[PDB]
Amino acid sequence: PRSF
Amino acid sequence: PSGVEGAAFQSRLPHDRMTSQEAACFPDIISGPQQTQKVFLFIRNRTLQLWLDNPKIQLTFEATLQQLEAPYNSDTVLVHRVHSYLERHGLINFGIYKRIKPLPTKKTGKVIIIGSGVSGLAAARQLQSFGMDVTLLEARDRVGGRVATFRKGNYVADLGAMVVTGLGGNPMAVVSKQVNMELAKIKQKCPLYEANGQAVPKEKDEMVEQEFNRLLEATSYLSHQLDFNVLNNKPVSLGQALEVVIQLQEKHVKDEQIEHWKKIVKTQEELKELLNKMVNLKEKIKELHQQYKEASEVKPPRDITAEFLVKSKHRDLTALCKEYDELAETQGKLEEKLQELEANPPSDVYLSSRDRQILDWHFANLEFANATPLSTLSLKHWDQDDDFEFTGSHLTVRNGYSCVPVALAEGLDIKLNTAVRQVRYTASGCEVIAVNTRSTSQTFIYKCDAVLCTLPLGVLKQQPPAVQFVPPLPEWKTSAVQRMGFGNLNKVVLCFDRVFWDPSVNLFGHVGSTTASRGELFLFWNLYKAPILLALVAGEAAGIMENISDDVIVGRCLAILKGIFGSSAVPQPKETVVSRWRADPWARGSYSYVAAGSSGNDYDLMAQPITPGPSIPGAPQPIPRLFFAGEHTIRNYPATVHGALLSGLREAGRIADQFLGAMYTL
Amino acid sequence: RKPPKGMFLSQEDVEAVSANATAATTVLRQLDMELVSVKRQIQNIKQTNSALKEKLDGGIEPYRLPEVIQKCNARWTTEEQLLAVQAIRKYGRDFQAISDVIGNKSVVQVKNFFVNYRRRFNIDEVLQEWEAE
Numbered sequence: 001p002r003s004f
Numbered sequence: 005p006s007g008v009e010g011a012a013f014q015s016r017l018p019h020d021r022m023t024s025q026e027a028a029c030f031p032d033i034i035s036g037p038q039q040t041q042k043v044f045l046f047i048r049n050r051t052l053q054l055w056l057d058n059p060k061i062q063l064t065f066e067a068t069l070q071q072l073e074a075p076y077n078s079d080t081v082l083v084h085r086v087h088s089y090l091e092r093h094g095l096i097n098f099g100i101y102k103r104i105k106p107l108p109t110k111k112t113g114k115v116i117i118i119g120s121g122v123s124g125l126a127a128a129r130q131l132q133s134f135g136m137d138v139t140l141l142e143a144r145d146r147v148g149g150r151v152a153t154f155r156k157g158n159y160v161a162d163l164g165a166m167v168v169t170g171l172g173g174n175p176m177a178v179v180s181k182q183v184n185m186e187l188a189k190i191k192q193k194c195p196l197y198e199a200n201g202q203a204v205p206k207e208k209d210e211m212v213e214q215e216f217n218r219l220l221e222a223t224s225y226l227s228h229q230l231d232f233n234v235l236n237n238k239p240v241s242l243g244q245a246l247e248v249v250i251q252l253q254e255k256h257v258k259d260e261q262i263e264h265w266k267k268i269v270k271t272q273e274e275l276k277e278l279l280n281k282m283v284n285l286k287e288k289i290k291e292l293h294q295q296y297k298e299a300s301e302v303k304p305p306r307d308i309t310a311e312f313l314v315k316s317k318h319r320d321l322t323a324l325c326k327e328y329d330e331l332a333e334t335q336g337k338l339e340e341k342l343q344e345l346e347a348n349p350p351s352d353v354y355l356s357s358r359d360r361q362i363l364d365w366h367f368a369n370l371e372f373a374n375a376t377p378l379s380t381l382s383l384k385h386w387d388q389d390d391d392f393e394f395t396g397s398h399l400t401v402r403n404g405y406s407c408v409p410v411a412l413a414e415g416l417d418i419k420l421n422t423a424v425r426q427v428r429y430t431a432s433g434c435e436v437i438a439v440n441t442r443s444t445s446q447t448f449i450y451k452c453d454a455v456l457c458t459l460p461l462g463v464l465k466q467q468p469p470a471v472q473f474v475p476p477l478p479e480w481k482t483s484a485v486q487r488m489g490f491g492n493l494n495k496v497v498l499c500f501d502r503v504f505w506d507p508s509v510n511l512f513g514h515v516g517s518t519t520a521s522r523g524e525l526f527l528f529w530n531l532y533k534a535p536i537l538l539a540l541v542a543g544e545a546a547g548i549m550e551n552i553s554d555d556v557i558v559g560r561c562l563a564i565l566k567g568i569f570g571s572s573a574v575p576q577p578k579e580t581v582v583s584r585w586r587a588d589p590w591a592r593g594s595y596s597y598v599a600a601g602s603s604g605n606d607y608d609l610m611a612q613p614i615t616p617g618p619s620i621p622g623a624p625q626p627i628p629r630l631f632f633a634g635e636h637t638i639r640n641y642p643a644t645v646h647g648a649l650l651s652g653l654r655e656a657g658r659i660a661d662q663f664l665g666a667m668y669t670l
Numbered sequence: 671r672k673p674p675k676g677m678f679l680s681q682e683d684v685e686a687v688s689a690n691a692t693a694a695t696t697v698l699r700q701l702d703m704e705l706v707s708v709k710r711q712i713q714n715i716k717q718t719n720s721a722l723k724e725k726l727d728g729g730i731e732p733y734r735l736p737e738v739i740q741k742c743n744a745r746w747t748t749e750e751q752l753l754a755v756q757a758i759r760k761y762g763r764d765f766q767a768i769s770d771v772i773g774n775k776s777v778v779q780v781k782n783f784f785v786n787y788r789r790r791f792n793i794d795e796v797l798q799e800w801e802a803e
Binding site for chain 2: 671674684749757770
Binding site for chain 2: 001002003004
C-alpha cells in the first residue's frame with residue numbers, strides 16, 4: 001500500500 | 005471490464021475460473037465436466053450482475069431465475085445452489101437493501117458481536133439478514149469504531165478513515181449506491197513546501213520523486229533477487245533496506261569520483277614522464293648545438309673528418325629536433341585530454357541536504373500509508389497485497405465517513421457504553437461479561453451460541469489484557485497477535501472561517517527540518533465544503549505527538565501554515581480537534597501493517613475460529629464458538645474499511661454455515 | 671531480475687555494508703580518505719609538472735637548424751665516398767642516417783654503394799669494428  | 009464479465013471483476017472474482025471458495029461448496033461441479041463449470045460460472049456472473057445493477061432491492065432467487073435465460077435457466081437446482089452460496093457469503097444482498105421477503109417471525113441461534121466497527125456492523129447486518137438473533141456490544145457511545153467523524157455546526161471532518169481507494173471491485177461501490185455518500189475525487193496535484201515556506205521547484209520535485217521510486221524498486225531487488233531478508237538472525241525491515249540502498253548509492257558516488265580522479269593522476273604521470281624525456285632531450289640538443297657550432301667554426305677548406313663532423317653533428321641535431329617535435333605533439337594531446345577530464349567531473353554528492361529532506365517527505369508519505377515507521381515494515385511482505393489493488397481514482401467522503409456505519413446500524417440491537425471484559429466459551433455455548441463505561445460497577449452477562457470478536461488488533465495486543473478470554477486463546481492465535489503489527493497515524497482538524505489556501509488543491513505537503521520529524525505535520529488536506537484543513541502526523545512523530553497538548557500542536561500547525569501563506573493570511577482556528585488513536589483504549593492504534601517477522605499468513609491465523617474442548621471428557625469434539633473479524637483478519641485487504649466490511653461478511657457466512665447449516669453443498 | 675539502471679547493488683557490496691552497525695560509515699570514511707589522498711597527490715604532480723614546463727621555456731627554437739634540400743645525384747665524388755666510410759663507422763647500418771649525412775646520395779644508392787665498394791672500402795672491417803662500440 002502507498003498513495004499518489 | 006463490462007457485462008457478466010464486469011460483475012465478476014467488481015466482486016473480486018475471476019470470471020472464467022472457479023475459486024477455492026466455490027470448489028468447496030460445489031465439489032461436484034469443479035470436478036465435473038468442463039462444460040458444466042462454464043455453465044455455473046455464467047449463472048454465477050449473471051446473478052452477480054443482477055445484484056450489482058440494482059443493489060437497493062433484495063435479489064430473490066425466483067426474481068433471479070426469471071431474468072435467467074435458457075439453457076441456463078433449465079437446472080432450477082444449480083440456480084438455487086448458486087444464489088444461496090452468493091447470498092450466504094455476502095456477494096449479493098449485503099449492505100442496506102429493501103427486504104422483499106420480510107424477516108422471519110421466529111429466529112434461530114444467538115450471536116454476540118463485540119464491537120460495532122464496520123466489521124462487526126456488517127456481520128451483524130448479515131446475521132440478522134439470515135434469521136439469527138444478534139446483539140452488538142459497543143464500548144463507545146457511538147457506532148463506527150475507527151470510522152470516526154467530527155461534527156460541530158457545518159464543520160465535518162473524518163478523524164478516522166476518510167478515503168475510498170477506488171470503486172473498481174470495491175464493495176463500498178455497492179454501499180455508495182445504497183447510502184447517500186457524496187464521493188469527491190482526489191486531485192493528484194500535491195505541491196511540497198519546504199520548512200522555509202517556499203514551494204519546491206517543480207524540477208527538484210520530479211527528480212527526487214523518481215529517486216524515491218527508484219529506491220523502492222532497489223529494495224525489491226535486494227529482497228527478491230538477493231534474498232536479503234534476514235540479517236544477523238533478525239528479519240530485515242523495509243527501512244533497513246532503504247538505508248543499505250542509499251548507502252550503496254553513496255558508496256558508488258565516491259567510487260565514481262575516486263576512479264575519475266585516479267584517471268587524471270594516471271594521465272598526469274604520463275605527462276610527467278613525457279616532460280622528463282623532453283627536458284633531457286632539450287638539454288641533449290643543447291650540447292649538440294654547441295658541438296656543431298664549434299665544428300662549424302673550423303672554416304674550410306677542411307679535411308673529410310672535419311667535414312664529416314659538421315655533417316654528422318647536423319644529422320643528430322636534426323634527428324633529435326624531430327624527436328622533440330613528436331613529444332611536444334604528444335604533450336599537446338595530453339594537455340588537452342587533462343583539460344577534458346577536469347571539465348567532466350562526476351557528481352560530488354548522491355543527495356544534497358535539501359534533496360535528502362524532500363526524500364523524507366516521500367518516506368513520511370509511505371509511513372503514512374502503512375501507519376508505521378519504515379523500520380517496522382517487513383521488507384519481504386509489506387507489499388504482499390499489491391496485487392489486489394482496486395481500479396479507479398481514490399475518493400473522499402464529503403459528508404463524513406460516519407454516515408456509513410450509522411446507516412448499517414439501523415434495525416440492529418446495539419448496546420452502547422458496554423465494555424466487554426471477559427469472553428467465556430465452552431462446549432455448550434458462551435457467556436460474554438461486559439460493564440457500563442459510565443459506571444463500571446454495573447455488570448452485564450450475555451449468553452449465546454457464538455461470539456464474533458471484532459476487537460482491534462491493538463486492543464487484543466494490550467498487556468495486561470483489556471479483555472480476558474476464558475479459556476485463554478491458544479498459543480497459535482496469541483503468537484499471531486504478537487507478530488502482527490498495529491500502527492499509529494493521527495490527524496489534526498483545523499477549522500477556520502474563510503478559505504485561505506489553493507482551493508483547487510485538495511492537498512499539499514510540508515517538508516520536515518529533520519528526518520526524525522519527517523512525519524510531523526507533513527501533509528494537509530482540503531476535501532470539505534467548509535473551510536477545513538486536515539493535517540497528518542505519521543511515522544515516529546505520531547507516537548510522540550500524543551504526549552503534547554492540543555494547543556501546542558495547533559501551534560506548530562499554524563507556524564507551518566504561516567510560512568506557506570504569510571502570518572497575515574491565516575486566522576486562528578474556530579474549532580480544533582486532534583486525534584490520539586494509540587491512547588484511545590477502544591482502538592490502541594490506527595491499523596495494522598505487516599511487521600518485519602510477520603507475514604500474510606498471520607492475517608489468516610487471525611481469522612481462524614476457536615473451538616473449545618469438550619465439557620464431558622470423551623465427549624465428541626464440538627462446534628467452534630469464538631469467531632474473529634475486523635481489519636486485521638482479512639489477509640488480502642487489510643488495514644482498510646473495505647477489508648473490515650468484507651471480514652464481517654465472511655464471518656456471517658461462516659457462522660450461518662455452522663448454526664443454520666449449509667443446504668447448498670449437495 | 672536486474673537492478674534499476676543507475677542503481678548499484680552487488681552481493682559483495684551489500685555484505686560489506688551490513689557486517690556491523692558502523693561498517694557503513696567505515697566504508698565511506700575509507701573512500702573519503704582515498705579521495706583526499708588522490709586529490710592531494712594530483713596537486714604534487716601538477717606542481718611538479720609546472721616546474722618542468724618552466725625549464726622547457728622557449729622549446730628548442732634557438733637550437734633549430736635550417737633544412738638542406740638538394741636533388742639526389744647519381745655519381746660518387748671521391749669526397750662523398752669518404753663521407754660514407756665515415757658514416758658507416760659512426761652509424762653502423764642505419765642507411766637513413768648515412769643518407770641525411772651525405773645529403774645528395776639519397777637512400778637506395780647507399781645499399782648498392784654498400785656492396786659496390788664493399789670489397790674496396792673493407793666495410794666488413796668497418797662494420798665489424800662499429801659493432802664493437
